[PDB]
Design a protein around this nucleic acid. Structure first.
Ligand code: MG
Ligand code: MG
Ligand code: ZN
Ligand code: ZN
Ligand code: ZN
Lengths: 286, 130, 69, 49
RNA sequence: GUGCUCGCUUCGGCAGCACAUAUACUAAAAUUGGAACGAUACAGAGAAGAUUAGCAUGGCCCCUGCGCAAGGAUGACACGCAAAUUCGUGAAGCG
RNA sequence: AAGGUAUGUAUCAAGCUUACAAG
């Protein structure tokens, strides 16, 4: 039902060689979601690595901007529901065999024949990004994805192959933590990992820290930039732009709005292209 | 065709509304994929050079407009000073001597190229996992 | 088992109406009665779907348009 | 740059995939406008005829 | 690894030449979803009396068959929507 | 060879199917 010319393939699946040789079939396996006969491709990423063929069709990759074999985001290198919750919209797709399943895949293929360049509905909200997902977009990826999976007969100690057992050995997997949207087991741990970062301790008082030592102004931040980034928060009581240290001092009347500034700027408020400098002010008449 | 037409830059603030990946050029949803006509042999040679020794020359057309470096892990290239795999090398080091029986006379003693080499607590955890 | 009998009622009427439209795809009484049956559930994003694919079969009737509108 | 070859197909294999699927026919081309002459209604008597 | 060349000085050491990257990698699987048939118990059998030959139409139902034959209980599955006639309500317009 | 010993449901394994994507 489907031909192709070249696969989607995020960068960690290609392997560390710029010179890889790759083979193709014409109607290979089926897609592991929609049973559609794509063209399976196979290659060797690296010299200690399994072959990692091709898992879903080009259509089921163009739907969710997903790579071709490891099923991660093509823009980030992240799972699917991390992206869809991080963009707060799911781009629904049915679950059963026909019930709207191959119907909607067929029709979304029929209205994807023109472009072949971008995902079908994610294009509008893949622009308003880079705030909540960019903190976890692991560049320089780990190639343990590509290592060959663990053999039996070392698990049973029987492996007569000796050294030339191509798969692996002495990696016993653990039966406590190992589809396409939800629910996936390590993703819950990763969203707990992002919800539970390492901040500064919240000091024992009643919201007196409306001042904060934010600095690293340099030549990027100006006065109206930071006070219009705080005017959407609310009202000041005293601003200054102290340029001996390249810093700015803002407060709020009844702290709460500047409270989310403390949530926005734990080395995190990224405007004008800079990791801003943040440590804690006085609020102590000092 | 003229150089000035295609080399003329684009006026604008570059449109930073997009992400890095969607602003980047493509034809295929993942990078601009285009045909090529490299020599088979030098492709295979520099491929095997990287596959063995972890360095190769870089393939490009318009990255910096000048590109003549090595890639992968850099320092081992100049440790061997840019030799290849099809070269009788400067030294014959860390070789590994096989024992040979190439008579085809003794039986169960002839190992030609099939010669196996001169070199020839976890199970509690494995039984508790299973 | 009130949820069981409720979803049983809903699933049996939906299966009935889907087989009724799948038999005759031309008489549009089935789509308007099925779509206003889901409109009787009073919170829907699927009766829109029933009308919006009920005009794929026949857009030239006024009754479907004015009833969906 | 990559090298793309095409895998051999052995001529002793049956068809591999179950070509037996039927989904209903999809959404057609969305309708062109209709643009007749002004539609008349006859009477209550010739309609009775 | 090999074989060849004193080729450079020891048969031995070295140098050059020729040869140039296989594998749906597993004997496994912690494996995997398990539909068909057979068993179990139900339901049971077209056409306004009874027994009934059939051939069709529709598609998200298939089986046997080399089938653009044919047979699978007519292969099964196919049901109450009345409309316009009386009357209520409401709208648009006019006198 | 079909044309006759009906078919239609509800639970219970091998046959066949991939040996894959995976913090
Ligand atoms: Mg029949
Ligand atoms: Mg028949
Ligand atoms: Zn697919
Ligand atoms: Zn991938
Ligand atoms: Zn092993």
């Amino acid at each position: 039902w489907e031909d192709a010319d070249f696969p989607i393939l995020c960068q960690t699946c290609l392997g560390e060689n710029p010179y890889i040789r790759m083979t193709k079939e014409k109607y290979g396996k089926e897609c592991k979601i929609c049973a559609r006969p794509f063209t399976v491709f196979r290659w060797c990423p690296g010299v200690r690595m399994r072959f990692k063929k091709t898992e879903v069709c080009q259509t089921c990759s163009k739907l969710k901007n997903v790579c071709q074999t490891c099923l991660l985001d093509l823009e980030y290198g992240l799972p699917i529901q991390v992206r869809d919750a991080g963009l707060s919209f799911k781009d629904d797709m049915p679950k059963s065999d026909v019930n709207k399943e191959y119907y909607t895949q067929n029709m979304e293929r029929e209205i994807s024949n023109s472009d072949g360049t971008r995902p079908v509905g994610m294009l509008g909200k893949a622009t308003s990004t880079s705030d909540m997902l960019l903190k976890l977009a692991r560049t320089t990826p780990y190639y343990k994805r590509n290592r060959p999976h663990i053999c039996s007969f070392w698990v049973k100690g029987e492996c007569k192959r000796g050294e030339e057992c191509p798969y692996r050995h002495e990696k016993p997997t653990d039966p406590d933590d190992p589809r396409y949207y939800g629910i996936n087991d390590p993703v819950a741990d990763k969203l707990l990992k992002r919800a539970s970062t390492m901040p500064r301790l919240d000091p024992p008082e009643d919201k007196t820290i409306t001042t904060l030592y934010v600095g690293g102004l340099g030549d990027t931040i100006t006065e109206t930039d930071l006070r219009n980034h705080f005017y959407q928060f609310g009202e000041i009581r005293t601003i200054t732009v102290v340029q001996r240290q390249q810093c700015a001092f803002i407060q709020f009347a009844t702290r709460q709005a500047a409270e989310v500034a403390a949530e926005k700027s734990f080395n995190k408020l990224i405007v004008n292209g800079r990791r801003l400098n943040v440590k804690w002010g006085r609020s102590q008449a000092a | 065709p003229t150089y000035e037409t295609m080399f003329a830059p684009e006026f604008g603030p570059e449109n930073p509304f997009r992400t890095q990946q969607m602003a980047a050029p493509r034809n295929m949803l993942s990078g601009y994929a285009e045909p090529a006509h490299i020599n088979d042999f030098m492709f295979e040679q520099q491929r095997r050079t990287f596959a063995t020794y972890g360095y190769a020359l870089d393939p490009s057309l318009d990255n910096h407009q000048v590109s003549a470096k090595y890639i992968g892990s850099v320092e081992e290239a100049e440790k061997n000073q840019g030799l290849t795999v099809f070269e009788t090398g400067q030294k014959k080091t860390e070789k590994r001597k096989k024992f040979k029986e190439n008579d085809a006379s003794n039986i169960d003693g002839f190992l030609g190229p099939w010669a196996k080499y001169v070199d020839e607590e976890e199970q509690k955890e494995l039984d508790e996992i299973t | 088992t009130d949820e069981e009998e409720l979803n049983d009622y809903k699933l049996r009427k939906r299966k009935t109406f889907e087989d009724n439209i799948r038999k005759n795809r031309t008489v549009i009484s089935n789509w308007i009665k099925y779509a206003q049956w889901e409109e009787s559930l009073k919170e829907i994003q699927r009766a829109r779907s029933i009308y919006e694919r009920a005009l794929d079969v026949d857009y030239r009737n006024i009754t479907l348009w004015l009833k969906y509108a | 740059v990559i090298r793309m070859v095409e895998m051999q197909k052995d001529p002793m294999e049956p068809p591999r995939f179950k070509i037996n699927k039927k989904i209903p026919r999809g959404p057609p081309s969305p309708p062109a406008p209709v643009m007749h002459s002004p539609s008349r209604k006859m009477t209550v008597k010739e309609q009775q005829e």
